[PDB]
């Protein structure tokens, strides 16, 4: 499913990301709007053999198992392919726990180099939530 930007916003507020360990929730639409366009079934192959899955493109060497990445963690206990449903119930469980894991967002590459330092809270202007 490709998701609305407020729809997403939306979503994640239901599902307990607004602020979540102080990330409002413009960081987290922003970091699915440059790691997925909105689309839950985003997949991108990494340099190191890994994979990336879903709105917020959670990565197979730690996180999910894919049947396919030698010598990696499944710290969320999920098939990959459960990060590409259009519910997005598993990638924002599995967010948390990345989140959470000492690094904060910046776990996020691309929450880093486009959404750190920037006005975040443009992605939910306008969103009913």
């Known amino acids: 499913k490709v998701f609305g930007r407020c729809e997403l916003a939306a979503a994640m507020k239901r599902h307990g990301l607004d ?65 590409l449903s259009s519910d997005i119930t598993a990638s924002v469980n599995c967010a948390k726990k990345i989140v959470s894991d000492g690094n904060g967002m910046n776990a996020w590459v691309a929450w880093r180099n486009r959404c750190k330092g920037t006005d975040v809270q443009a992605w939910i202007r306008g969103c009913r939530l």
């Not at 839950?40 to 730690?62: E, F, V």
């Open 19 to 83: 602020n979540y360990r102080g990330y409002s929730l413009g960081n987290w639409v922003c970091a699915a709007k440059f790691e997925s366009n909105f689309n839950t079934q985003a997949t991108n192959r990494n340099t190191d053999g890994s994979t990336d899955y879903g709105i917020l493109q959670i990565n197979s060497r730690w996180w999910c198992n894919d049947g396919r990445t030698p010598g990696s963690r499944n710290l969320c206990n999920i098939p990959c392919s459960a990060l």
